[PDB]
Amino acid sequence: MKERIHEYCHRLHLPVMAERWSAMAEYASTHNISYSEFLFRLLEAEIVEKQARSIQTLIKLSKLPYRKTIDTFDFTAQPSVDERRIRELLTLSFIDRKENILFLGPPGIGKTHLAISIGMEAIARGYKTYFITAHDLVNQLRRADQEGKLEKKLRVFVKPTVLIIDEMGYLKLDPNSAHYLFQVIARRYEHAPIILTSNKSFGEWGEIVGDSVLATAMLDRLLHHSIIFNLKGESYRLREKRLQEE
DNA sequence: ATGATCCGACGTGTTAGCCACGCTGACTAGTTATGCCATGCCTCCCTT
DNA sequence: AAGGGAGGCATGGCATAACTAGTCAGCGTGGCTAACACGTCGGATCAT
Numbered sequence: 601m602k603e604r605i606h607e608y609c610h611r612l613h614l615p616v617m618a619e620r621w622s623a624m625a626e627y628a629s630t631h632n633i634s635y636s637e638f639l640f641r642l643l644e645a646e647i648v649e650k651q652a653r654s655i656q657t658l659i660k661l662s663k664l665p666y667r668k669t670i671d672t673f674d675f676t677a678q679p680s681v682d683e684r685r686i687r688e689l690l691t692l693s694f695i696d697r698k699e700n701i702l703f704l705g706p707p708g709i710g711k712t713h714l715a716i717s718i719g720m721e722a723i724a725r726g727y728k729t730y731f732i733t734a735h736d737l738v739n740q741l742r743r744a745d746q747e748g749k750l751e752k753k754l755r756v757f758v759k760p761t762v763l764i765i766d767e768m769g770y771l772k773l774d775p776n777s778a779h780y781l782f783q784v785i786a787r788r789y790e791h792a793p794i795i796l797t798s799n800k801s802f803g804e805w806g807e808i809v810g811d812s813v814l815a816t817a818m819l820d821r822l823l824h825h826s827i828i829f830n831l832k833g834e835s836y837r838l839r840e841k842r843l844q845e846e
Numbered sequence: 847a848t849g850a851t852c853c854g855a856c857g858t859g860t861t862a863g864c865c866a867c868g869c870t871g872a873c874t875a876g877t878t879a880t881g882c883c884a885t886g887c888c889t890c891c892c893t894t
Numbered sequence: 895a896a897g898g899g900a901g902g903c904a905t906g907g908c909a910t911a912a913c914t915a916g917t918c919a920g921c922g923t924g925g926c927t928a929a930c931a932c933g934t935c936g937g938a939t940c941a942t
């Protein structure tokens with residue numbers, strides 16, 4: 601009969617339930633527990649494992665290079681940013697408010713770290729997330745359009761609840777393809793937040809995309825509902841380099 | 847990589863209204879039938 | 895039984911005359927379209 605239970609558990613797509621079947625049976629036998637409560641505990645454990653696996657699969661699907669969180673961010677080394685605003689962001693009220701989040705400042709000041717932390721927080725609470733660099737997004741959209749499947753990739757870039765655009769400005773975008781980026785900003789406008797990190801000021805966006813009018817339209821759509829952080833201070837990579845040297 | 851599930855879009859059915867196609871009649875033009883003559887092919891008969 | 899020869903009938907070509915098909919116009923009837931609602935099928939995504 602035990603083999604039948606194991607086979608049924610595997611067929612019903614409950615691997616972990618079967619794995620811990622003997623342990624839970626022994627626990628129930630040793631200590632008297634109501635059947636309802638025992639099933640509640642078993643289903644709760646299965647749901648916890650399923651949630652962990654789903655979070656890991658979402659992390660894999662969302663191309664996050666390195667996993668980080670707010671807990672690892674040192675506000676003392678970066679006093680230019682108020683921790684209160686970051687904590688307010690972590691509440692994910694902007695998702696309901698459709699507000700974007702723009703990080704600006706010199707390289708290595710934690711912009712990417714903060715963006716990844718916000719993305720991880722969104723993923724944990726069950727919100728679909730996606731991470732990509734601006735150059736990669738533009739190139740992927742261009743390649744999809746050249747294949748006559750731009751709409752599919754546009755859906756891919758629009759479907760995520762939280763889209764992260766990292767390093768917008770380090771590499772100049774091809775003028776013939778900048779519009780692709782605008783499309784995303786045009787379709788995610790008032791629909792889903794965008795977390796964009798850059799080292800260039802807004803006035804220079806025209807240089808990045810090579811079209812002043814398109815850059816102005818993109819900025820107007822992006823900044824309509826957004827929270828802008830102007831981070832300052834010394835580079836964290838250089839700080840670590842000095843600490844290692846010293 | 848395959849199967850199962852869920853979601854979204856398209857097709858269908860129904861009803862009503864409008865537009866296009868079919869039928870009919872008349873007139874004109876082009877094609878077919880027929881007669882006649884000539885030639886070729888098919889059939890029948892006879893011989894081996 | 896097969897081959898060759900002879901005879902008869904059928905076909906083709908040409909010319910003329912008559913009948914039928916095509917075209918156009920008008921009117922009537924049937925089919926297509928549109929709108930809306932509902933159900934089914936296809937596609938995409940996630941889990942094994």
Ligand SMILES: Nc1ncnc2c1ncn2[C@@H]1O[C@H](COP(=O)(O)OP(=O)(O)OP(=O)(O)O)[C@@H](O)[C@H]1O
Nearest residue numbers: 672673674677706707708709710711712713836837
């Ligand atoms: N305050 C901080 N606390 C902890 N780690 C930090 C902090 N600031 C930066 N780092 C780490 O330093 C490295 C570079 O920082 P990060 O990429 O977040 O900065 P950035 O401004 O987005 O960089 P860049 O523009 O050069 O790409 C990463 O490992 C990041 O985790």
Ligand SMILES: [Mg+2]
Nearest residue numbers: 708711712713
């Ligand atoms: Mg960075």
